[PDB]
């Protein structure tokens, strides 16, 4: 016993325990069950992270500081041998000799020893069943809530000897009071000065942005990790900062989650103040406002939109070929420096009567259960993403009935049964409804001169207020000839780089870029017939001349006009 | 116990670790997670091949080189082997005395050993859970993003003890810099000359042609395999290459995914200009069809094709008996030397809305989920193919949408969730619509 | 007079062979139409898992019932004594009201449940909160001279008057208006602009975003998003024209000025 | 049999097996599939407690008394110690551990040994199909149908040896014969006397109310419980009664079902005397007239109705607010013994001619198959119910025969797979087309004169092919004004639950009945706003001072 199991009060005697502030009720309640006659063994259960060991670490400082009531003063709090009971006990009956020896050394401790069997579900069990029954063992458990129900919860005589003590996780107001007491241990370990701005902003920020850990544990390791980055500051090669601040706490949360709460050291004046100037490089047109997708990421870079709904919820309605899916690849290229750095859910096989489990996950115990869902796992893995829902009207109405939950609540539970914060993602829903109402009305159409005149999908397939749950229903206008003559150029600079990677220089006389823009313009089909007229009037003779050796690399190629054609020459 | 001195820092001292490049913000986060007093346990999480085992081998190459903070100077990174701790632990309590005998003499250095549990999700390993929480072992795990989900996320009291220090897949521009600092390990194992065109065009070519892998594991491999091909041609029986060039990279990808960018200069380019003669040997008439098909195969072999869309997506409208699926059999006989080398799919077999689940496969939790669907599976197997969506005249938008993404941006995902790229395939759709 | 039926059915006074009531409950879209079951985490059992709320407005086809009848034994049976909700049960036919004709009373559910469904110690509530058209708020400050005026006009458009005289508590709050939507939803004015309460910072708002546009862009459909669309141009980065990224020195007061509807918040 | 020699035939020669009778219709298969060349392993399939002891465990009692076939002569039925010697170690793995020590001797017995059941769905069976694959292992098994159908699927190491002996429960009369040769084992144990009408109460009276035990199971323990209530009655610490009666059986049957003696210990003719008195405990009355439809279910015991038809076929015409809800439940309260035998379905759903497959059932492939129908699935749920078809006349003007197969051939087929039987039903149809005219007098001596204007006016939405298949057009007796004062006080019972809880007396002298005389008996609108003649003038200002 005392030779082996960790004496938690003798650790508290030396001050080798963390100062448990708060939790006055759960230490009173775990005392009020420790001094009982029958069934006198608590189990501090709760979510993992909330302080179920810090209760009993704080009971053992409530005992040696006399703050325990009488009757438990001078009582030793002992742990159990955490797998040292099941250490090198090769011989049959050595574990029963070890566990009876540390049971019979409590019966000759008269009942003055509290066993803190931490992680009780790893227990044995039948050997403690008599000593827990007769009140001779004054045990204290700490399972989790899921580990205390899925690990021998009943088992005949084993669902009464332990009385549950629920350790609810703190609020943000409690956790700041938790962090004021612990900070003298993280100041004294990192040799930094954790600031009172930074402890109120490590419990508020890690309550919002951490969905797996809304704990007191998660506010600690922003406090603990911002302080280690100050050790990175002053131990690497007034001006050498010794304080962690709320600008240093948030710089950990922009690295833990990856959610950009950091812009006081960024070129936001350079990059985020490009209203369309970075998106007009790849989405020419859609100039109703600046862009109205660079206004929802501009309202909330660190996060200053409503923090209960996503950063942006956009319906991208328009004709074909106008730039709905290109705005989701110019925004995903602007935020994440890659076009494919969004969660692109095409509504491929979304009409089915159950494709729902494709993007949220199979129910528990089914065949694709252990692999999650497509939408849900991609936002658990990175909470700050763009989510493109391409051609969202081509999905079943059962898809929107789980997609309501991401648009208003900002939180989609899945088939496994875990909830996923979409509160930092950008949810774009391109679609093709109202496609005839924009090619007809070139200015007469407002957003609401359309969004109820097209109604057999807006009333039946869309809900009445599903279009109220999306933030901004951006309507895309068809591309006039002043646009297609200018995305001839950004589709031709894509072509020049496709040939400078082969070592060819391509020049186009402005008689010929005048000729692509005539042959690639019709307002019903948008801008795909433009880049279809690039790959059949330019790249179709060019590939023949490149293959047949008629166009030497290293010389310039001038696509000039011939008799009603574009030809390439040296 | 003392059967475990597995020193990853003396492998870096003896120069037996590969040089790591440019992950100086995931190491800086791995360092500063390893330097905090409660649960200093980072978990380099991220996709396979990304570079997360080779961050701890860049801790170990910075600790041994003194580019670390001066509170982390002179540490020891120790790669704990799960297999070596469970091997031979036949008797009861031999593994627990083995693991406690590791945890005891990790504590004897007083926090001067950084433990590295590579493939962390293999932690039999039941009992480190209290010592991980107090900061008694400094435990850089490095598990993947899906193996953390299905072991360590299941132990919700164990994933508390670990800070995911997520290792993102680097760009092409970050992989060329990774490759420019690694080529002296492959110029010296193969005794070749990996030139800088064969590095710019191996993180470019693999980053577009390869989708089943990551990014840093594709470009690095291609050069590893082009060099082992050059050394093969150096040995086996100027004119020979001592030098991995950008054409040798494309030859390693041509016979790995279908078609290169650069193998064309000899007689294939002769029979590409002879395509309309070769296609008219079996499809007479329809010059406007054979020209529109052969231009798209020339547009891809010249590298001129839009790299996001497919190579060509044609609709073959005509009467009956005029050669609409004779062209697609003479096309696949041209480029694959067999008529039945299309991914041919008679569209008249899926006249229902539920028939779209055989081209993409069943969703998670249904019958035939684990088998995929034979459009995305047959294109994930051979990525350069001809897809014949023969007799494409259905009355269901749900089954048509599938081709909304195949033809534009060239992707289509399984029911299993695996995105299959169609950007190297030729989708032909031969219907009967203008017939009368 | 909303828990008045608890003094009249839980004890039992006001003719319990009745439904609870489906006359008018007029409301604004989002902030006091369906929110009044999100703020009910404070009454008897602390049950936040009571989420059964139904839109029952335009259901005329006989194929919308087979979703309520596998998660029935995941949320209500581990903790039986709870609150159970139902609101907006307004305009349906006896194709779906045939189940819901004995859910007006009797407590114990026999459709596919069968067992003791202890709804005499749980709660059974029905309301209809049709506050969408034919009468609306504006922003949230008016008097009480528009309480009950439309009997066959607001809820009972095309349905029988025996569905609107079987209500005990014929009660409603006001169709207030004209001044207050940034104050009933003060969560994006107070809480978001004491966000930098530390570092010597305090975000003071001008009367342009307070009393100037407090009335102008009224639309009776959206409500909460044009609050975040007419004042969508000042929050973080138009604030960060001179505040963020190099100008974090104290000694100055954050203000907005007399400009047009988009302001660069210069200090 | 070196370790043990547990013998079923020795238990037969010593009398430790219980004396067995009957059950020779299904020993003529157990043996016919036992003494065969192949397929030599019978399995008795039924409900748990049908008589698997009555067939197998008496066969050892049948061996030594010589009435078994030849070939089975000189065969000893053996058993194992399976239940105590399946095991022998401490930890798990003892499912079939020491089976090989006691299965090797059975090969040497050379076609004599027969091994017992030993709950062969628990032997699963890691060693059994190794032991049975040669076929020399000669056995008998027995397993219930839930543990025979769910247990195995296509084992040709099992179904190669097993024969489908689907054993069934005996009838009412047969289990009475079992207790005559079973009361000789209860004359010695409980030391009582058992009589002949005492053993009929265990079988025929528990046949209608008790179904959780099959017919020679529930009739045996009902006997032996009273025989175990004898010394509980004699020797509760003058009252020595070892002669048991049917009253001792009907005592412990009343304490088991839930229903008391009050609706149990009578013939159906004996509760028929107060049938109208139990009708008119909740029926508004007019007992001089409306006993015609009372006689129709009274005509349903002799059997002169159509056997290819349900029990009843009627019309229930009259006003609303009169007994549309009241009379229909009280027909189910007596015969059908329930308050939830109600299938109230308003037929205003027939606004489309596609709505035939919604109360009945969609075809396979069409939408509406996973839930079934309405007038079928409830009758699939309750085949022992009255059926009440509200407002028939709003069927489609082109589409009917929704109610003709239920009345002509008696059966009806939904779109699911199994035909629904309506033989134990009574149809109740409320096609109010011309009887919504309660405002006329029409009811002073006769109540059919209200109906005579309907038969000239109801037949344009009816047909001649339908009215033949319903015998008595029973008119609703009206709700008079003085007749409200009998049946209006059963709404007040929650406040009647309240007034005894507070110690106060607010009992009336003509102050609360004048508003209870304003519910029903309407000239213009109905009883839906007539219910509000109470709440707005009594319930608000008088008992709001009761929670304060
Ligand atoms: N009330 C509290 N006061 C001070 N620190 C606390 C309090 N509650 C939790 N903590 C700290 O939170 C961190 C983690 O909490 P733990 O108690 O170790 O985890 P847990 O909730 O006990 O789950 P365990 O340890 O697996 S049983 C430790 O640094 C504790 O000191
Ligand atoms: N406004 C634009 N600016 C630049 N390129 C554009 C624009 N609109 C269209 N394009 C080009 O047109 C191609 C197809 O347009 P997309 O935007 O991808 O499709 P879409 O416009 O979203 O409409 P769909 O077919 O309904 S998904 C893109 O790859 C671009 O090259
Ligand atoms: N930043 C880097 N610098 C140098 N080499 C790198 C870098 N990132 C990855 N590599 C190399 O990439 C290859 C594979 O990377 P690893 O890190 O070993 O595997 P991984 O990324 O951990 O994935 P696994 O399979 O889950 S361990 C090795 O050859 C590494 O040397
Ligand atoms: N232009 C052609 N050149 C050579 N053979 C041809 C040609 N057209 C048809 N055939 C022959 O006719 C058959 C081809 O018919 P298909 O072309 O497959 O049918 P289709 O012309 O595509 O139209 P369908 O009936 O709508 S599938 C084969 O036997 C070919 O050999
Ligand atoms: N014909 C019969 N003769 C004698 N006893 C019988 C007869 N039928 C049933 N029993 C009695 O009823 C019981 C039947 O047991 P059994 O039906 O085998 O139960 P189970 O099916 O649960 O194994 C035995 O106690 C037996 O004594
Ligand atoms: N005989 C009765 N006994 C008790 N309550 C009645 C009776 N008749 C009517 N009621 C009450 O009157 C209300 C309205 O009745 P109504 O639906 O018009 O009856 P019906 O369906 O027979 O026409 C019901 O809620 C019921 O509580």
Author numbering:
A (entry chain E): 161 to 283, 295 to 408, 525 to 857
B (entry chain D): 161 to 283, 295 to 408, 525 to 723
C (entry chain F): 579 to 647, 660 to 857
D (entry chain A): 161 to 283, 295 to 408, 525 to 835
Quote the original article.
Heat-shock protein (Hsp) 100 protein complexes are critical cell stress responders that solubilize and unfold toxic protein aggregates and amyloids, thereby enhancing thermal and chemical tolerances. To better elucidate the Hsp100 disaggregation mechanism we determined cryo-EM structures of the ClpB hyperactive variant, K476C, bound to the model substrate, casein.
The arrangement of the P6-P1 seam in the Post state involves substantial conformational changes of the NBDs in both protomers. The NBD2s similarly rotate upward and toward the substrate axis in a clockwise manner. Based on these comparisons, the Post state appears to be in an intermediate translocation state with respect to the NBD1 pore-loop positions, with protomer P6 on-path to bind next site along polypeptide, above the P5 position, while protomer P1 appears to be transitioning to a disconnected state, beginning with release by the NBD1 pore loop. Notably, the P1-NBD1 is bound to ATPγS and in an active state in the Pre-state conformation, but bound to ADP and inactive in the Post state. This asymmetry is identified in both Pre and Post-state hexamer models, in which the overall length of the NBD1–NBD2 double ring increases at the P6–P1 seam interface compared to the P3 and P4 protomers across the hexamer, going from ~75 to 106 Å in the Pre-state and ~77 to 96 Å in the Post-state.
